[PDB]
């Protein structure tokens, strides 16, 4: 029954909003990702060019095999970026190994 | 008010631990799922029969098209089920429509 803290050396962590750098033209563009050895997760700018959207991450595993482009992670809508025509989509999945990827965006 | 509550008619919600009904033999078995018209999510029993695991949900969309078994959602490891040889994996994705699915479990 002990309590410990991380209060950034008694300063607290100071937050300002991370502003979007919305792509100049691309219909879909990776914002950021992290692979920590167990989880592959990230954030993706998605242009609101149609109501129905499907966004997926296609990847090559730990030995750089794409498995006929069959290693797939689905992204989820996170929310619109206010004042822009882009939205944030996020993804996160347990992944044993990953060497490369690209993003696929399907509109109807 | 500016603050509202749901306190179950002043009784509070009473939580009993939901005990696992581990499959009697299956290597992978759906526990539960929910589709609410926007999000398709759920929970899956996965037998710990090898260290390396990949668990995916393959589904047919809103007009019952499988797209050659190409509509894929990746599940993530949630935790072991204490005292059993099964684990919980979960999944959740934004999905426009879905009519059917099955689960695929790859060990290595
Ligand atoms: Cl610190
Ligand atoms: Cl990220
Ligand atoms: Cl639109
Ligand atoms: Cl995850
Ligand atoms: Cl109460
Ligand atoms: Cl009561
Ligand atoms: Cl569920
Ligand atoms: Cl659909
Ligand atoms: Cl069918
Ligand atoms: Cl185990
Ligand atoms: N996914
Ligand atoms: N409260
Ligand atoms: N309530
Ligand atoms: N309450
Ligand atoms: Na501290
Ligand atoms: Na300070
Ligand atoms: Na402070
Ligand atoms: Na990044
Ligand atoms: Na791998
Ligand atoms: Na592809
Ligand atoms: Na079964
Ligand atoms: Na269910
Ligand atoms: Na799989
Ligand atoms: Na448990
Ligand atoms: Na998922
Ligand atoms: Na069927």
Numbering used by the authors:
A (entry chain A), B (entry chain B): 2 to 109
What does the primary publication say about this deposited structure?
Glucoamylases (GA: EC 3.2.1.3, 1,4-α-D-glucan glucohydrolase) are amylolytic enzymes, possessing specific raw starch-binding ability through their carbohydrate-binding module (CBMs). GAs from Rhizopus oryzae (RoGA) posses an N-terminal starch binding domain (SBD), which belongs to CBM family 21 (RoCBM21) and shares relatively low level similarity with the SBDs derived from other starch-processing enzymes.
The asymmetric unit of CP90 reveals a homodimer in which each unit is arranged in a slightly tilted antiparallel fashion. The RoCBM21 and the CP90 share a similar overall topology. CP90 crystal structure showed only 7 β-sheets while RoCBM21 has 8 β-sheets. The major interface contacts involve hydrophobic and hydrogen bond interactions, which were mapped onto the CP90 structure using Pymol. However, two of the aromatic residues (Tyr93 and Tyr94) and one hydrophilic residue (Asn101), which form part of binding pocket in the RoCBM21 have been moved to the N-terminal unstructured region in CP90 (see the unstructured region in Figure 1). The dominant negative charge near the binding site II is caused by the replacement of positively charged Lys91 in RoCBM21 to the N-terminal unstructured region of CP90 and the additional negative charge provided by the C-terminal carboxyl, which is proximal to the site II of CP90. Although CP90 can adopt the second binding path (hydrophilic binding path), the dimerisation provides an alternate binding path to connect the binding site I and II. The proposed alternate binding path for CP90 involves the hydrophilic residues Lys54, Lys55, Glu107 near the binding site residue Tyr52 in one subunit that connect to the next subunit through hydrophilic core Lys97, Asp62, Asp65, Asp68, Asn69, Asn70 and Asn72 situated near second binding site residue Trp67.
